[PDB]
Design a protein around this ligand. Structure first.
Ligand SMILES: Nc1ccc(C(=O)NC(=O)N[C@@H]2O[C@H](CO)[C@@H](O)[C@H](O)[C@H]2O)cc1
Ligand SMILES: Nc1ccc(C(=O)NC(=O)N[C@@H]2O[C@H](CO)[C@@H](O)[C@H](O)[C@H]2O)cc1
Ligand SMILES: O=c1[nH]cnc2c1ncn2[C@@H]1O[C@H](COP(=O)(O)O)[C@@H](O)[C@H]1O
Ligand SMILES: O=c1[nH]cnc2c1ncn2[C@@H]1O[C@H](COP(=O)(O)O)[C@@H](O)[C@H]1O
Ligand SMILES: *Cc1c(COP(=O)(O)O)cnc(C)c1O
Ligand SMILES: *Cc1c(COP(=O)(O)O)cnc(C)c1O
Lengths: 807, 807
């Protein structure tokens, strides 16, 4: 036992054991002689869940009595990962459960590995929602997460012949012990139909109804006895040839069947639009119901805050208007005032292909009334623009919520800005770019709406839970208070010259690496050298994230070794992992290239154990918890101006890895906090990128001037990495040479040079560790508690509280 | 409190209460201030379920240790109804739970009404399976019920404008506390593919796989601590555009989506065939697995008995052969010997349109290997016939498993007889008819195979549970032993002249009628006179059951009243209820006719409260438990030779109703047991029916000779019962006059006369009750415990046991 895991009291352990046996018997209907590890996992899960119940019921009862302003976080993604360990940590039950299971003859880690990840998200945006829920509970806010209970989350990735294969993520197969179905709270959602204009107001009729059934999952705060709720909706068909009619119910229920895995290119698919309205319509009725139980909607914004995670739930704006105007009978102007003061929008990217632009004909058929409301919103908004900038007809077309052209579309981002009192970017540089480029016109019209809220990650899951060894040595010296006040890590700077601490920091990292190296062999049968530098790049596969630039460096290292075999080089294990969206051809070709490189490099006798290339299969939250604590070097190399913020970068910094990256997204603030001397910065800044675009990017120039780069391209073209299929990577070479929107070649030279400096420092164990200490010590700003406290104070208008609850 | 409901001990009640509160808190995650009646129902349900667990685990553990011969009852239908009260009764917890809930300020009856019926059956055949499970557990047999877990059971019937409307039976919406999912025991089921003939045996390849996930439901015996299992399979797709692929999983899972409600006409639908193989394939693998854990399959028949409930699971025969021959490598002759000794078949009807005759092209595409096995079975069987009856070529074509003609079909009944060591009818007269007509050729070839097993009903649900008042007065005089030894009711004959008993029997019936009369107003807002004779006919709507004959009598009574308004007539409340299969036009027209008659009769001032016609909506198991105890007259009027047995008839006899009926099915044995003087028998016997068919049935003859009958037909034709739609019932009149396969007119005169005798007896309260006592006293033979004991001894080769288990 380690301290930060709580106390293992005698009667506490005694109680856990009897309840464990009680659940195995009564709940699982099992007996010790036939129970399997999975059965034991569920017994433990139900045992821990029991401890949540009392707190969950009184927290909600408390909000009913106090009636504080309620925060509603709307998102179509909640990348939760596993729940068991996180629950024990927040309830201070980890050591007790560890002891209790030990006495029962069971290994708790083994049991924890049985839980399926709740992968209801694609990557950053979904995981941000998850960290936010944790921080909002830890800060005592009356917050509710609202989304969709997908029967199938992000697909499980299988690598066959070096290619990605997608497999259904049937995460509910064995059941979900954490959720509680609330069929009694089912609500109706309407689709299609037509709008009738009677004497007194518009009426939406002849609609098809789909029921929204909620499932509640508890969200425990960190040791403050606060347990908030994450409510996820499931689609159900109303009960009203016979056989075919029953079988056709599936049509309606398909709405909550699966998570769309396309995080790169917006697809105007009808099913996706249905999902977006489904979550919005059910959620708003729930919100209003709770409000009416606290008819003067003037106080609505004082009791309700709705945060839109990107434009995915943007229909909340016209839906709130529909309800207030059509159902509650408020006049337009009043309803609009309430709507704007209630809603706030968060943008996550400036890349055009990711922005939602719904075809008018789709909204016309599916949501006829909302389209009319959107047109009216646009009309009134443009009248305001026309009055502020008389005669500027071009601005009018640019700011319109309706885009003209081949097919008319609705720009959901413009809709969100017009209908929100606050719009924020997720990193200082990103928020600035929003004001200077993409949303410049809106900023000039309403400057007060634009804010910045730099992202963060929760130190519970991303430190205490996944790196107990590091959390312990830190606590030994500054206490446990930093876990909910991460800024305290700064006190660690006074230990940068402490020989003992330096030794412990390095020991923990070594232990994490051996632990991960072992895992690689157990569950994947691959052998790596634990003494090599762990060079890691894990995140979804995208051209802008430039996994390709990493590949070029790897090949360069390989070619240099083959050039001078007996020359010493710092050993490296290069790990790249991440999923590619199913229809993203280039991303899939990049995964293939990575494995192809490994096939050559990992079997070259001359290389030995000096260089290894491994593709981490099925990267997901639970895998991130294993690899991040074991990393030495974090690759954050997106083209300057493309990664809005990034969050994986923060996870690595908090866990003892140094960072090599561009001045993009949050990397800028990270370097600023730790000091540029303690970061491995390289490449073009946003300004350099622009200037290059003015001139015109010509990749051929770099190819002609850099011999090493030329050699790599020729190897790719000639089939050096694909003997049986010589032209296998022709698409990659053609993209790099003629239409690379992300300028991979432009940063190649500086990148390779920077990597040499990384290797130089790694050769000096003591100085590498001292730099690590300086990074960990200054990672405090990146806690989602800080992010949430800012949202609370500057956007929602509520004060966070660290005050514990009762028992 | 009443005796037969067990003791309400102090610490037993104390324990139930604390566990009730524990579940409401920890399981339902609720608090007393927001809990609804449904929440209380679930808390109680989980509380009672807890008491089942210990017994369930040791009963199964016991079978593993003793290793007795195992009985497998295969059925595509299990009409279970509600489980809460039945569980309390069998566990002797009813009074304790009643007291415990009372002390908590709750009414247990109210809570019991919240449970949804598990309606996984159509009628008699499905309910028989349910009663059988109860008796097998009560008799200590190591029995397992195997079927399909339909997401939607028999449709809920709504009557709109007098017409039947079907509504999806979403019985799992709020969850099922009685079942335990066993995903760890999932098995693969194969479909389609092709057969490869290699060197060593045939091979079924290129198949599509569908997973079978089992859900176990406990089946408690009556106070013997035995808890058997009913295992129901659910269809799941294997995990191996992306979105569409995931959505298409529904195709595979549609197999267990809904129960086919067509109990009248066989439809060769592919989905139904898939359901039949699905249950058979998953079940047999489970059976074999359990056997191999008890490779000499010679002892297989000594450890396994498979009972086929009708031909629906007949594929078990060729599937067992497939496994033994193709997988286990036994030679054909040996495998066949094992198969025959293992399987037994039960027939439920002689009506040709109900018999399963699958088109060869369907089996050819879906189950190619089974078709080959069936052909081989047929070939060897016909060689035996040819040898026993040399030169009888006609017999060869008649007995073939393959029917020639427009489209080749497989006669599943012939397959079942050839592959079973026992074939039984469900009532003496039915079994005889099987041997004389439909299966005459098979009987002559193998007389030893044919048996009779007269049906029965369980006295727990059909007496103790639904009629506690009657069960109590009986117990007061002869004890409680009759509940599991129904033959003891005969001792009641010595009380036929007991003035006290006569008074109590009549009092209970009166109380049941007032109780039902009240229910009719509460949940259906209809007022009836509790002092009238309750004339009831409840069962599925079929032409052979002749609800139409009942209608003719009702109209006759109405016309007689209108004829002589001031003439005294015994008051009657005629209740008819039952569902019509969705595609059965005539059955739906009959329901409409019933309501139409009520619309006229119930609003005629001259009739007053002397005659009322009510159609009991949504007849199902839970409704049967309410109306049967309240009935005075039971209508069992099927055309002689058409109702194989009937079971509703037995339920009425056990609950104090007199019976008016034909000498059909079990009615014959019932009259034989009680004495014909104590039964209201009328109409043609089977012999009379045949003779009429020889001559030729001419309905016109009856129409011309019976004035009262002529008047009714003219009223129907002229639109007397359908003013706005004069020809609404032209199809009914046309059927009755020109093509009535069931000779409604032929029994009309005798039926009306018999009904007059019923009314005459009802006018003498004392003599009516004495006759009732003679019926109840002789209903012992109709307990499913007797039926099951006979199956056990004469077919399965096992001895029933009344010995209790431990605790
Ligand atoms: N239709 C979709 C569906 C999903 C996405 C999506 O997942 N997008 C992202 O995750 N974006 C990521 O969200 C993170 C959290 O703010 C940022 O730090 C990161 O820079 C951004 O790229 C984008 C569009
Ligand atoms: N394809 C199907 C589906 C369902 C059925 C069906 O439910 N049949 C019956 O219920 N038949 C009934 O089964 C009872 C139990 O033995 C008998 O007493 C009764 O006489 C018989 O008609 C018949 C064919
Ligand atoms: O009418 C009410 N009376 C008492 N408590 C209530 C009432 N409505 C809500 N509550 C409490 O408030 C919690 C919040 O429920 P919500 O509507 O899901 O937010 C409930 O679980 C109850 O504890
Ligand atoms: O290998 C075994 N060891 C000990 N008990 C067993 C074993 N296999 C089955 N059992 C017991 O037998 C019960 C019957 O399981 P079944 O296979 O579903 O019939 C199980 O719940 C166990 O109690
Ligand atoms: C933190 C996280 C992300 C986001 O990583 P970035 O490098 O910021 O894109 C994506 N996936 C998982 C599973 C994560 O844990
Ligand atoms: C007993 C029962 C039946 C069978 O009734 P019969 O009159 O024999 O056809 C049908 N339905 C239900 C719900 C039953 O309880």
């Amino acid at each position: 036992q380690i301290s930060v895991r709580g106390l293992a009291g005698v009667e506490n352990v005694t109680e856990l054991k009897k309840n464990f046996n009680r659940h195995l018997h009564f709940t699982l209907v099992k007996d010790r002689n036939v129970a399997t590890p999975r059965d034991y996992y569920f017994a433990l899960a139900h045992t821990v869940r029991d401890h949540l119940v009392g707190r969950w019921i009184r927290t909600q009862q408390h909000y009913y009595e106090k009636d504080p302003k309620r925060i509603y976080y709307l998102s179509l993604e909640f990348y939760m990962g596993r729940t068991l360990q996180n629950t024990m940590v927040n309830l201070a039950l980890e050591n007790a459960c560890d002891e209790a299971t030990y006495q029962l003859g069971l290994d708790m880690e083994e049991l924890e590995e049985i839980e399926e990840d709740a992968g209801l998200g694609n990557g950053g945006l979904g995981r941000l929602a998850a960290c936010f829920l944790d921080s909002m509970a830890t800060l005592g806010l009356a917050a509710y997460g609202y989304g969709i209970r997908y029967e199938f989350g992000i697909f499980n990735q299988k690598i066959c012949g070096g290619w990605q294969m997608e497999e259904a993520d049937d995460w509910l197969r064995y059941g979900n012990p954490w959720e509680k179905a609330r069929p009694e709270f089912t609500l109706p959602v309407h689709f299609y139909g037509r709008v009738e204009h009677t004497s007194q107001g518009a009426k939406w009729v002849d609609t098809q109804v789909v029921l929204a059934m909620p499932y509640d999952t508890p969200v425990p705060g960190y040791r403050n006895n606060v347990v908030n709720t994450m409510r996820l909706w499931s689609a159900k068909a109303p009960n009203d040839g016979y056989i075919q009619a029953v079988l056709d119910r599936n049509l309606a229920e398909n709405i909550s069947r699966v998570l769309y895995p396309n995080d790169n290119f917006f697809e105007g698919k009808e099913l996706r639009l249905k999902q977006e309205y489904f979550v919005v319509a059910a959620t708003l009725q729930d919100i209003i119901r709770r409000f009416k139980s606290s008819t003067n909607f003037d106080a609505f914004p004082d009791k309700v805050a709705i945060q839109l995670n990107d434009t995915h739930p943007s229909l909340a704006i016209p839906e709130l208007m529909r309800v207030l105007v059509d159902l509650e009978r408020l006049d337009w102007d009043k309803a609009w005032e309430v709507t704007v003061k209630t809603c706030a929008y968060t943008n996550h990217t400036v890349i055009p292909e990711a922005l939602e632009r719904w075809p008018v004909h789709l909204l016309e058929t599916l949501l006829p009334r909302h389209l009319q409301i959107i047109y009216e919103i646009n009309q009134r908004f443009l009248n305001r623009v026309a009055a502020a900038f008389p005669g500027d007809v071009d601005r009018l077309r640019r700011m319109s919520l309706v885009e003209e052209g081949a097919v008319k579309r609705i720009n959901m981002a413009h809709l969100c800005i017009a209908g929100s009192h606050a719009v924020n970017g997720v990193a200082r540089i990103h928020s600035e770019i929003l004001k200077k480029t993409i949303f410049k016109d809106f900023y000039e019209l309403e400057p007060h709406k634009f804010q910045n809220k730099t992202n963060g990650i929760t130190p519970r899951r991303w430190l205490v839970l996944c790196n107990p060894g590091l959390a312990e040595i830190i606590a030994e010296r500054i206490g446990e208070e930093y876990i909910s006040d991460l800024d305290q890590l700064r006190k660690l700077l006074s230990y940068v010259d402490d020989e003992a601490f330096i030794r412990d920091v390095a020991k923990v990292k070594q232990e994490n690496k051996l632990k991960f190296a072992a895992y690689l062999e157990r569950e994947y049968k691959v052998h790596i050298n634990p003494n090599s530098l762990f060079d890691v790049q894990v995140k979804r596969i995208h051209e802008y994230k430039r996994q390709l630039l990493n590949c070029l460096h790897v090949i360069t290292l390989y070619n240099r070794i083959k050039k001078e075999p007996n020359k010493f080089v710092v050993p490296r294990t290069v790990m790249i992992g991440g999923k590619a969206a199913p229809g993203y051809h280039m991303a899939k070709m990049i995964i293939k290239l990575i494995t192809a490189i490994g096939d050559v490099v990992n079997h070259d006798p001359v290389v030995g154990d000096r260089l290894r290339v491994i593709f981490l299969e099925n990267y997901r939250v639970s895998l991130a918890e294993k690899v991040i604590p074991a990393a030495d070097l974090s690759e954050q190399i997106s083209t300057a101006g493309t990664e809005a913020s990034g969050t994986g970068n923060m996870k690595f910094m908090l866990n003892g890895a140094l960072t090599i990256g561009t001045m993009d997204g949050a990397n800028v603030e990270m370097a600023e906090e730790a000091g540029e001397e303690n970061f491995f910065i390289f490449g073009m800044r946003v300004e350099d990128v622009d200037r290059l675009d003015q001139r015109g990017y010509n990749a051929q120039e770099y190819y002609d001037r850099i011999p090493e780069l030329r050699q790599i391209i020729e190897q790719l073209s000639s089939g050096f990495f694909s003997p049986k299929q010589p032209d296998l990577f022709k698409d990659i070479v053609n993209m790099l040479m003629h239409h690379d929107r992300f300028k991979v070649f432009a940063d190649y030279e500086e990148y390779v040079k920077c990597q040499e400096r990384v290797s130089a420092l790694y050769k000096n164990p003591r100085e590498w560790t001292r730099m690590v200490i300086r990074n960990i010590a200054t990672s405090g700003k990146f806690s989602s508690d800080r992010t949430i406290a800012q949202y609370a104070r500057e956007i929602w208008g509520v004060e966070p509280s660290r005050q514990r609850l009762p028992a």
